Structure 1
Amino acid sequence: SLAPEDGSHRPAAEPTPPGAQPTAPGSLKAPDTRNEKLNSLEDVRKGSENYALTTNQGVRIADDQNSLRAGSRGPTLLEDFILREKITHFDHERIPERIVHARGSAAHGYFQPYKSLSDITKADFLSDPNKITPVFVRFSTVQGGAGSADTVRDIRGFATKFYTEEGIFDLVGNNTPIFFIQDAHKFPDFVHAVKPEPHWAIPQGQSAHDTFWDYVSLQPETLHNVMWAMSDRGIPRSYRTMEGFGCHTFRLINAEGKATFVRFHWKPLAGKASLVWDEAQKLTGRDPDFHRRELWEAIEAGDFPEYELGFQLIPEEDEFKFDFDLLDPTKLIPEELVPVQRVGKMVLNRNPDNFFAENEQAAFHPGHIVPGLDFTNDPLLQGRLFSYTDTQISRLGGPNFHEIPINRPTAPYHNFQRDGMHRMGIDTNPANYEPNSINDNWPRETPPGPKRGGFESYQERVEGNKVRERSPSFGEYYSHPRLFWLSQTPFEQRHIVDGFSFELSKVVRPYIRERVVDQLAHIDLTLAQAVAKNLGIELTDDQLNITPPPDVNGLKKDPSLSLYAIPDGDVKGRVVAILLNDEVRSADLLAILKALKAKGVHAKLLYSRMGEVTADDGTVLPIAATFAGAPSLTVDAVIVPAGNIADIADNGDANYYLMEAYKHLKPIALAGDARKFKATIKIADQGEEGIVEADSADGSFMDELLTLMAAHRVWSRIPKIDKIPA
C-alpha cells in the first residue's frame, strides 16, 4: 500500500476546473458520460485495480524488480522469459507517425442535426433531429512531428469521425477554407518544401525557412493559404476558438437523385480567438503541450468544446456563376455570396482513456463517405482519395486497420475480404467470394434507395481527352489573397505584415525574400510596401505600378473572413492569473473569485513559492503555481488584488508577469495599492483603456474586467507596446 491513506492520489469523478485535481483517463474521470461508440469500446477496455501483475500470457509475476541471474551479482540468463517479454514489448512500442498532422489531440463526443435534411441529402445521420451520432475528433498541426509544440504558426487539422448507422463518415478538414496547392500530384513537393530541410532536418514546426518561401515564390497558387497562415489564423488560442472547413466542394444527393454542391463549415460556439506571435512562440517553449492540455482540461471542467456544422449550398445550375472555379481548392466561397446554412451541433464531452490506443491509432480519410454524399472533380480531393487508404498500410501495419477498436464502425460490416496482418475477425461464412451458392450469396448487395440503400455514385457527365493539364479556370492567384487582406481589421493587417516580415527574415537567401515581396506587390501595394520596409527592400517603379487584381464577384471585403471584425467573444472556459501577496485583502479576493465563477472563468492563484499564504482575515489561500511556473502566456487576463503589495513590488518575476501580459494586449486589473504596478507598465495616473483600476475589486471592477475579456485583447494598446522592454 503506496497510495496516501487520505486518498488524495485519485481525482474526483466529477467536473472540476483546470489545475484543481490531477487529470485522468476519461472513463475514470467521467464514468457516466456515455455514447454508443464509447459503450462499444467496453469489450477492449482493461482495468487494473485488484488484479495480479502478469506476463501477456497470463502468468503471475513474483518479482518485477529483478532479472534472473546466476548469483545476485552474476550474468543475466537467457531463460528469463519474463524480462524478455517485458523488454520486447517496450522495444517495439513505436509505430510510424502520420506523414503530416503527426501532432494532434483528440476527444469523444456526439452530433445531432437541428432538423431533417431529407430534402437535400439522404445521409442517415442528417435525417432526424433525434438521431444522435457519436463522434471522435482529432485536432492537429500540419508540419511538426508527434513530439513538436502546439502553439506554432501553422495550419490546423480538424478531423471528425462520425459513427453513423450507415457507415463511418470522416470529415477531414482544416482551420482555413482553402489549401496551398491546386493538384494532389504536387502534395509531396509542397509538403517537402514546408517540412524540415533534408540535409539537417531543421526547422521543426515552422514554415520560416528557405525551402518553403522558395516554393511559395515559384508557385503563386499558394499565396491565398499563405495569407491565412501569416495572419493570426495560424496561431489559434485554442482548438475550441478556431473555425473548421471541409476544404472542397463535395455533393449532397437526395432520395430523388438531385445533386447539390456543398462546402462544409464548423463554427466554434466559444467564438474565434488567436494568440499574438511573440506570445505563441514563447509559449512553444514554456508549454509545448498548451493546446492538448487546454482541450483535455476544458473537457474535464465541463466546458465542452461545441461547434455548429454548416453548409454552403450551390445548385448544380450555378456551377459556373462565380469568377473562380468551385473545384479549385485555392479559392474560398465568400459567405456574402453564399451563406452558411446551420445544420447541427457537435459537443466534445469525454477524453480518451489511452492516448496511443485511441488517438495515435485513429485513422481518418475523406474517402470514407456514406450514401447521400459524393465527391467532385476537385483535383486535390481526387488524389487525397488515394493517399488516406494507402498510408495506413505502413502506419497501422496492414489492411485490417478498421478493426483497431477506435476505427471500428458501429454500423454492421460484412464482406468477403479475408486475412491480412493482425486479423481479428473470425469469419464463419462457408463462402469468401461472390456470387456464391454455398451461402445463398450472403452477404448480399443492396440496391440504392432512399434509406439503408447501397452506395451508387452520382452519374456526372465526363467528357474530354486523357490529359495532364491544369484547367485554365484555375489560373488566377491574387484576387482571393486580396479579398482576404481587405477583409481584415487594421490590427489584423499589421499582424499579417509582421508574420511575413518575421518569416522572410529567417530566409537566408535574400533573392527569395525579394521574389516573395514581388508576389505581395501583385496582391496589394500597402501590404507589399510594409513587408518590404521591414526587410530593408525598396519596391521598384514597376512593382509600384502593378495593377491590383479584380474584386471577387464585386466584393471589396467580406467581414466573415476576419477573426475579430464582428465581435463573437465568450468568456466561459477562459482563465485569469491572480498574483497573490502574503497578506491579501480578503474582501477583494471574494469579489474577484465569485464574479469569475459566475461567468465560468477559471482562476489560478500565483505566488513566489508554492504552499499557502494567509489573507488579512486569516483565510488560507492555496497556491497553484509560481509566477515563473505559470507565465502570463497561459492566461487570458491578470488581476492583482490589494494587500501587502510591498511583498511582491520588487519581485522581478511579478513585475515581468505584468509587462509580458501588457505586451500581449491582455486585460490587466489592479485593485487598491496594486495600482503601484502602474509604474512598471507606464500607465498614466488618469488611466488607460484596457487597464481596470479602482480602490477596491467591488462595484463595477469585475464587470469592466469581464467586458475586456469578452473582447479577447486590447488592440488599442498596440502602438503603446511597440516600445516596452519585454
Structure 2
Amino acid sequence: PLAAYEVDDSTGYLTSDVGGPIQDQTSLKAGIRGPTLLEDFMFRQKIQHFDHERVPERAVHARGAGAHGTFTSYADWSNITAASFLNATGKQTPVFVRFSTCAGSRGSADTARDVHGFATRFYTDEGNFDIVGNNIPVFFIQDAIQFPDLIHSVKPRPDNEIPQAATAHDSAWDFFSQQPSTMHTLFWAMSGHGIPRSYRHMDGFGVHTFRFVKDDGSSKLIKWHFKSRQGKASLVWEEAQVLSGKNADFHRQDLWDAIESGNGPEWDVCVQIVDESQAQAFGFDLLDPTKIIPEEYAPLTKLGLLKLDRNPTNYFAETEQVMFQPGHIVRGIDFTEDPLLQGRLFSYLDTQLNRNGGPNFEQLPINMPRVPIHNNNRDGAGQMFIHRNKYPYTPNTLNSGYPRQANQNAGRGFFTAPGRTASGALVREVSPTFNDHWSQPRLFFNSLTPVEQQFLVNAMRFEISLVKSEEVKKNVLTQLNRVSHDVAVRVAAAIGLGAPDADDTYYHNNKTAGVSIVGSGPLPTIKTLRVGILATTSESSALDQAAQLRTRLEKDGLVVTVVAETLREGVDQTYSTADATGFDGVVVVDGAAALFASSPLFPTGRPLQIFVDAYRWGKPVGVCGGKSSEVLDAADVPEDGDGVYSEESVDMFVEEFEKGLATFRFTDRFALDS
C-alpha cells in the first residue's frame, strides 16, 4: 500500500543517513579512559536524530491508533452525488482510519471516559477525501470560535496540569453549566458511549450536516453514520478505571489483535439524506451541530462497506503522521453553513504546520494521494518534489496554459453547490433557531433502558462529587434540571444538595431508536471476545480440563487465555499478571477449586478476585466440571444467576456460555435508585 516508501533492515551493515558504513556502539575518545571528541560524527548524527525524534502531539485527539483498509461501494450513487468513489457497484478505494480519545495527552489511557475520534481517509481516484468524525453524533458547542474555551475547560487545570484525560474537575463542569449547548454531548459522554468496549464496538459520525452534489448541480443535505458490524458495547466505569491502570493500551491492542487474527472490523458507511427544504422542518436547525435527526424522521441509507484489515508497519510514520482535514473534500460533496464546521475548515490546515514544522506535510507518504498532482505550489521547507514546469503561474503562455483550471464544466473540478446563497447583515450573532439546548438531551435520556439511565446518573454522581466549588455544583444542577427533574434529584442526592424545582419547559416523553447500547440486543458476533480459564498447575486434570475447554472455545474464534500459578505448556498467563479487565468472560475448571477457598507467586486472593470482579462487572462467569459450589460459595455468586453457568459437559458448558458472551452484560447485577 505504502510499499514504495518501505525500508528494509533485515540484513546489512550499519550506515549513516548518507550510506557510509559506520559503527554506533562506542564513542571516539582521546585515549581509552579519555574525553569524547567533537570529531565523532557517528556519535553526533545518531544523537541528533534521537534528540529530534518527537513532534508536537495533536492539539486534541492526541491518544489514538490507526489501520489500513478498503471501502467498497454497494451501488452507483451518481443519482445523488457526483463523488467518484461512490460511482459504481463494487468500486474499491483504499482507506486509513485513526480512532482516538479526545482530551488526554499521548500516553494517557485508552479507557478514559471521553468523546472518541473516528477519522477516515478515502484515497479516491479524484483525490483524498477525509471524514473526520466522532463516536458521538453531536458536539458540545455551536460555533468553532468557542473550541479553545471548551478544550481549555476540559483539559487539565493550567497551574498544575491536573487532572489527566478527565472531565471530573471544576473547570469542565463550570463550562458545561455556563454553556448549556454542551448538554447533549455531555449526556452521550456520561452514557456507555463515553467508555466503549473497543474501537470496533463503536459507531462513527460526521456530526455536521454536509451536502451531496450531483453533476447537474442539485444538492441534498446529508449526515454520515458509520454503523458497526461488530455491534455496540461498553465497559462499566469501575472496570474502565482498573483497565486504565492494568492496560493503558487496551483499545489499540484490541484493534491490532483483531486485524492480525483475520477479524478486521467492518462498518456500513451510511447517510441520512434530506431535501434542502427540510433544513428547519424537523423542529430544529440542520445547521446546529448539537442536534441529531431522529431515525424515525430520516432512515439510514447504506452506501458501502468499510473494512480495516492491515496494521501499520511503523506507527510514527503512519499513525502519528497522518494529517486529516475536513477541507480534504472531493467533487460531489460540499459544506454547509454550520458555524462549527465552518471554523474547522481553517483549523486543520493551520495546525499541520505546527505538527509537521513545515508546509510540505501533504508529501509525507501517509498523506500523499494516489493520483497525480498538478499545481503551482513551490518550495517551502522539506520540499521533496523536483518540479519540471519552470513557469508556475496562471495565466501563462510559456507553459502553454497548463495546468488548466478545473471546475463544474471542465476537468472534474470541485465546485460549490450552485444553489447556495447568503443574505443579510455581516453579523457576530447566534441564530435564535439554535436556542433549544435541552429537549434533545432529554430525547437521548428517554431512549436509554432503566439500567442505562442509572449508569448515566452514576457517571454524573461520580464526576460532580469531585467538583470542589459549591456554586459550580448548584449551576450544574440548574442545567441538568432543565433536561430532567428526575436526573437532577438523583444526582443531587449524591452531592448533598437540593435539586431545584421542576421546570418543565423542555420536558417531554419522546424516544428515538438506535442510541441505546443496552437496548441494541445481543452482539451479532462473538469472534475476538476474550475468555479467561482459571486453572492450576497443582492438578494435571485441571490442565486437562483447561485444554479441552480451549479447543472447543477457539473453534468458535474466541480468544482464550489459560491462567495458572506459573507458565508451562498450555498456560498463557500467570495469576500475577491476570486481571478480570483482561476477559469478556471467566471460567474456572473445577479441578482448580482449591485456589478459590496464599502464594509468593501472586497477590493474596487473586484467583478469587478475578472471578468476583468479572461477576460484579456483569460478565458471564461459570465453573466447568460439575463441582461448582466451593467456587460459587466463596465468590458469593448464586448458582441460579442469569449469566452464571455450571455444567459437567464441556460441550454443554460452552454452548450456554457463548450465549452469555453475546448477551455481553448481565444488567440485573446492578442496583437501581428506587
TM range (shorter): over 0.9
Q: 1:204 aligns with which of 161, 164, 167?
A: 164
Measured against aligned partners, the alpha-carbon deviations of 1:262-291 in whole angstroms (never above 9, x if no partner) come to 000011100000000011011111111111
Say whether the 8 Å CA contact 1:238–1:291 is kept in structure 2: yes
1:637 maps to 585
2:513 maps to 559
TM-score, length-normalised on structure 1?
0.89
Shift of 1:73: 0.4
Measured against aligned partners, the alpha-carbon deviations of 1:231-270 in whole angstroms (never above 9, x if no partner) come to 1110000000001100100000012211000000011100
- Pairs within 5 Å for 1:105-184: 105-184=65-144
State the one-letter code of the partner of 2:530.
Answer: V
Q: Distance in 1 between matches of 2:363 and 2:173?
A: 41
Secondary structure class of the residue paired with 2:423:
coil
Pick which of 212-221 and 560-569 moved more.
560-569
2:528 maps to 573
1:55 aligns with 2:22: no
Say whether the 8 Å CA contact 1:268–1:308 is kept in structure 2: yes
Say whether the 8 Å CA contact 1:523–1:548 is kept in structure 2: no
1:692 aligns with 2:645: yes
State the one-letter code of the partner of 1:434.
Answer: T
Secondary structure class of the residue paired with 1:559:
coil
Q: Distance in 2 between matches of 1:493 and 1:519?
A: 17
Q: Distance in 1 between matches of 2:109 and 2:592?
A: 38
Say whether the 8 Å CA contact 1:331–1:480 is kept in structure 2: yes
Secondary structure class of the residue paired with 1:283:
helix
- Pairs within 5 Å for 1:381-396: 381-396=341-356
Q: Distance in 1 between matches of 2:158 and 2:592?
A: 56
Shift of 1:598: 3.0
Shift of 1:590: 5.0
Say whether the 8 Å CA contact 1:588–1:696 is kept in structure 2: no
- Pairs within 5 Å for 1:301-450: 301-449=261-409
Instruction: Evaluate the alpha carbon distance shift between residue 60 and residue 486 of structure 1 in structure 2; reply closer, same or farther with a 3 A threshold.
Output: same
1:269 aligns with 2:229: yes
Shift of 1:449: 4.7
Say whether the 8 Å CA contact 1:329–1:378 is kept in structure 2: yes
Q: Distance in 2 between matches of 1:121 and 1:186?
A: 32
2:256 maps to 296
Shift of 1:591: 4.7
Shift of 1:675: 3.7
Secondary structure class of the residue paired with 2:200:
helix
State the one-letter code of the partner of 1:678.
Answer: L
Measured against aligned partners, the alpha-carbon deviations of 1:498-545 in whole angstroms (never above 9, x if no partner) come to 111100111111221111111111111111111111111122xxx333
Say whether the 8 Å CA contact 1:641–1:697 is kept in structure 2: no
Say whether the 8 Å CA contact 1:306–1:348 is kept in structure 2: yes
Measured against aligned partners, the alpha-carbon deviations of 1:364-389 in whole angstroms (never above 9, x if no partner) come to 01111100000000000000000000
1:653 maps to 606
Q: Distance in 2 between matches of 1:544 and 1:493?
A: 21
Say whether the 8 Å CA contact 1:501–1:531 is kept in structure 2: yes
Q: Distance in 2 between matches of 1:194 and 1:119?
A: 43
Say whether the 8 Å CA contact 1:659–1:680 is kept in structure 2: no
Q: Distance in 1 between matches of 2:152 and 2:278?
A: 37
Structure 1 gaps of 5+ residues are: 1-37, 613-620
Instruction: Evaluate the alpha carbon distance shift between residue 183 and residue 644 of structure 1 in structure 2; reply closer, same or farther with a 3 A threshold.
Output: closer
1:709 aligns with 2:665: no
Say whether the 8 Å CA contact 1:524–1:548 is kept in structure 2: no
Q: Distance in 2 between matches of 1:142 and 1:182?
A: 18
Secondary structure class of the residue paired with 2:307:
strand
State the one-letter code of the partner of 2:171.
Answer: T
Shift of 1:189: 0.5
Q: Distance in 2 between matches of 1:675 and 1:164?
A: 60
State the one-letter code of the partner of 2:236.
Answer: V
Secondary structure class of the residue paired with 1:533:
helix
2:631 maps to 677
Q: Distance in 2 between matches of 1:471 and 1:497?
A: 32
Pick which of 671-680 and 312-321 moved more.
671-680
Q: Distance in 2 between matches of 1:409 and 1:630?
A: 44
Q: 2:204 aligns with which of 231, 238, 244?
A: 244
Shift of 1:622: 2.2
Structure 2 gaps of 5+ residues are: 599-603
Say whether the 8 Å CA contact 2:69–2:96 is kept in structure 1: yes
Secondary structure class of the residue paired with 1:561:
coil
Say whether the 8 Å CA contact 1:642–1:696 is kept in structure 2: no
Instruction: Evaluate the alpha carbon distance shift between residue 82 and residue 76 of structure 1 in structure 2; reply closer, same or farther with a 3 A threshold.
Output: same
Shift of 1:599: 2.2
Say whether the 8 Å CA contact 1:559–1:565 is kept in structure 2: no
2:571 maps to 623
- Pairs within 5 Å for 1:488-637: 488-539=448-499, 543-549=500-506, 551=508, 556-569=510-523, 570-582=525-537, 583=539, 584-585=541-542, 588-589=545-546, 591-609=548-566, 611-612=567-568, 621-637=569-585
Identity %: 44
CA RMSD of aligned residues (A): 1.6
2:601 maps to none
Shift of 1:481: 0.5
Q: Distance in 1 between matches of 2:503 and 2:90?
A: 56
Shift of 1:701: 1.6
TM-score, length-normalised on structure 2?
0.96
Secondary structure class of the residue paired with 2:269:
strand
Secondary structure class of the residue paired with 1:560:
coil
Say whether the 8 Å CA contact 2:622–2:644 is kept in structure 1: yes
Say whether the 8 Å CA contact 2:535–2:546 is kept in structure 1: no
Instruction: Evaluate the alpha carbon distance shift between residue 46 and residue 476 of structure 1 in structure 2; reply closer, same or farther with a 3 A threshold.
Output: same
Shift of 1:649: 3.8
